[model samples]
Target: MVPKGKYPISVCMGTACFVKGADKVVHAFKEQLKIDIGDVTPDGRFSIDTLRCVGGCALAPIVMVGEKVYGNVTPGQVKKILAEY
Candidate 1:
């Protein structure tokens, strides 16, 4: 089902991204929102999901929120990323 949240997070899990701590990024989102992957927040503003690749190996470990693409993301920056939304 398509997420109805205001911000749907799509974390890239291609080989490059996976090795670059993609799971930790995913975990960071879960910890912050108290929701696991594929689950929307209670307020319906955020949610998370993962895709294998999006054709940006140079930007491996990328995340997409809404229509904005964030490259070279890390777990530490996950909160800041949310702050933008």
Candidate 2:
């Protein structure tokens, strides 16, 4: 289970997102958070999860941080985005 208060980062891994490079985004998050997908940080500050689709195909490659949807995410934006949490 995800630790209490740990932010949930759900990266869209659907067809739309995958074709747009969601894998890179996921890797970036894993690197930044130092955790694998479906795993939460030891400090319980963050967890990474994958979603099949969020119905935001127009905004493919989306990253949802605790319900905050970030569209058209690129690997470069991962760091800055994570900083907000």
Candidate 3:
């Protein structure tokens, strides 16, 4: 039952990222897209998910959209990042 979409958002929830406010970033995405974790938007433009870690601790608060990895992301950066896609 995997959802298909043009973009898949993978937010890291590991200790480093969690401490850096990954939850806030996830919240921003959910609020902006009107979707929850493991859910896809109606337009099939985006899907949201989480990972325990992405092995990029130096880049705390990492968000991976498709194959692109965004490091040190902030809640404010979420919209600008999504706009790029």
Candidate 4:
């Protein structure tokens, strides 16, 4: 099953995003959450997925949390970004 509630993050792992810092954001989440899927949500309601491309290259390192789309998220912003959602 896809689980309940919305996915917390849809990260673009396309070349642009990866090169910009998507990989680091992804790694931080993985290391912190451990469950990859259905993990970003501390309440266990949200999920996380890596998309090949979210179709917005100018907004590299993009992360969509619910209806909000965060562009060019840095390793520094990872924690606050995840926590906000």
Candidate 5:
């Protein structure tokens, strides 16, 4: 589980992830995060970052919400997934 008020969301853009649809995921987050900053920020909010590889290439299009690993996530899932934070 993620910490009480801390959330780390990593979108995998590795070869596998990219092939699986991570590029869309990344773009979605970048756009949505800017659009829905209010939903995320409560006196300024969590940060979104990118990871080259999480060593789980097999789980392409993967995302790590805090400590939880979500594989094969779609671009449409970014908002719902980040809401968990």
Candidate 6:
């Protein structure tokens, strides 16, 4: 694989998150990043990946931007999250 995108994005795909609708959140990131899942952005500034779990079921629908953890994320928040970094 390539070097981590300075800002690595990891979406939890664990059962808890899955049931919470993480897949939709994944698609939201796709639209904002303009890159498919597992594909790095053209600038290599970001990349999308999925994890089975973040070890916190209560934080279902988790999203990690580098090390900043976001819980209960929604598709709409995708762009807002990107703006910060």
By TM-score, who's the top model here? Answer: 6
User: On a 0 to 100 scale, what is the lDDT of residue 22 in model 2?
Assistant: 63
For each candidate, give its TM-score against the true structure: 0.57, 0.59, 0.57, 0.56, 0.53, 0.59
Name the runs in model 6 displaced over 4 angstroms.
1-4, 35-41, 60-62, 67-73
Best by lDDT: 6
Model 5 stretches astray by more than 4 angstroms: 1-5, 35-39, 43-45, 60-62, 67-73
TM-score of 5: 0.53
lDDT of 5 at 17: 56
Clashes of each: 0, 0, 0, 0, 1, 0
- Give the alpha carbon lDDT tens digit for every residue of 7-66 in model 6: 566666667666867678767766666544433344554544666345665434456655
Instruction: List all candidate RMSDs to the true structure.
Output: 4.1, 4.2, 4.2, 3.9, 5.2, 4.1
TM-score of 3: 0.57
For candidate 3, lDDT tens digit of each residue in 1-85?
Answer: 1435555656666666578766776677666664444333445445456663456654444566556555324468767765643
Model 4 Cα lDDT, one tens digit per residue, 1-85: 2434454556666665578655776777556544435544435534456552357554344556555565324466666665655
lDDT of 1 by residue, 1-85 (tens): 3345565556666676578666786666666664444333445455455653446655444566555655324567767765653
51, model 6: CA deviation in Å?
2.8
Residue 50 shift from truth in candidate 1, angstroms: 2.2
TM-score winner, 2 or 3: 2
Deviation (Å) of 38 in candidate 3: 11
Q: lDDT of all the models against the reference?
A: 0.56, 0.56, 0.56, 0.54, 0.52, 0.57
Worst 10 residues of 3 by lDDT: 35-44
> Which 10-residue window of candidate 5 scores lowest in summed lDDT?
1-10
Model 5, span 1-85: residue lDDT tens: 2212244555556675578666876676666554343434542233345563456555344555545555324467767764644
